[PDB]
Amino acid sequence: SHMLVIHHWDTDGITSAALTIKALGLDDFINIVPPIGEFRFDGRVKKHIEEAEKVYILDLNLPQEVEDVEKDTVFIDHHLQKKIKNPKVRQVNPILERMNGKEFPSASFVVSNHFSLWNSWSSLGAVGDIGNKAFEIPKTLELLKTEGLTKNEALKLVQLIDSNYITMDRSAAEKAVELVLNRPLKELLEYEPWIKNLEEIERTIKDVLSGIEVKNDIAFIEYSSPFNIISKIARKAVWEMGYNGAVVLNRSFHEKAQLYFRISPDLKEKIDMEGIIQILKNRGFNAGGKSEVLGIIFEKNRIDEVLGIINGYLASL
Ligand SMILES: Nc1ncnc2c1ncn2[C@@H]1O[C@H](COP(=O)(O)O)[C@@H](O)[C@H]1O
């Protein structure tokens, strides 16, 4: 009786949701996100699934939860993940399907290719996942050009849209899909509620950047905060400050710990980020990522365990 669209909480997932909603010609939909930084379906998500008729899951590297879905489901993602056995799920992943993953930098590009619907939201998703490197793909700037948007304007839009999930606002992150659907991107650059979020986030990121240390050109950044800034801290440490690797640890993310391990393409060969994921998953950790980035949420008492595993690989550099 309803159309459900579960999607990631960042720009990549929010643009993917808008692209999916537009391509399907939906006039009656429910779009939700799982709890930020929990990487699992909670009660709220599970109830919507039972009520909805068809479900779309976008940019959510959590197959173990999709495996149990008893609805007709299309699962689109670009993370490195395991093949889903559930027959009710139609998995669309241009990594499992063996195709090149550099052709698909973000879920937005995967969704666009899936529906053959290319607009500026396609670009935003790419910028929200690989940042400035998305502009080295000609499709990005060209689509941004139609809407008369500059490089910086899209980078600013990623910060504004991301500002919702960083501030832990499930409702504002979900509503961002309606605003992208119903307002030009260049209008949302003026959207005051997002702007107010971003001012408080930059101010608090500077604090974490002040207490960073370094070894072997690897940045070790430890902090405690309820904001989900761990994604940007790892990027800022590697992408902007130029370090070869960043290990970011949040000790008090809402009664749980949170660690991120991002490397530069230079170390992408020397470090097997895929293997480190499997080792963490085998050990019962809620871990996922890509070939250059690591994300974990776990119990506070396993912080030393996690650090030992990663300092393990870091010791062979
Ligand atoms: N516990 C987890 N389970 C599955 N995927 C994760 C997890 N933690 C982080 N990720 C993914 O890792 C990617 C890298 O984060 P980021 O560098 O901020 O884009 C993100 O797209 C996350 O979705």
Numbering used by the authors: -1 to 315
Text lifted from the article:
Methanothermococcus thermolithotrophicus is the only known methanogen that grows on sulfate as its sole sulfur source, uniquely uniting methanogenesis and sulfate reduction. Here we use physiological, biochemical and structural analyses to provide a snapshot of the complete sulfate reduction pathway of this methanogenic archaeon.
While the genome did not contain any related PAP phosphatase, a gene coding for a putative phosphoesterase was found in the genomic environment harbouring the ATPS and APSK genes. This PAP-phosphatase candidate, belonging to the DHH family, was recombinantly expressed and produced inorganic phosphate (Pi) from PAP at fast rates (50.2 ± 5.9 µmol of Pi released min−1 mg−1 of purified enzyme with manganese). To decipher the mechanism of this uncanonical PAP phosphatase (named MtPAPP), the enzyme was co-crystallized with manganese and PAP. The monomer is composed of an N-terminal (DHH, residues 1–180) and a C-terminal domain (DHHA1, residues 211–315) interconnected by a linker region (residues 181–210), forming a central groove. The DHH domain contains the catalytic site and the DHHA1 domain serves as a scaffold to bind the substrate with high specificity. The absent second Mn2+ would be coordinated by the Asp10, Asp57, Asp127, the DHH motif (His76, His77) as well as by water molecules. While the AMP shares a similar localization with structural homologues (β9β10β11), it is bound by a different interaction with the protein. The nucleotide binding site would ideally place the 3′-phosphate of the PAP in front of the manganese when the enzyme is in its closed state. The inter-domain movement, allowed by the linker, would facilitate a rapid exchange of the substrate/product, increasing the turnover of MtPAPP.
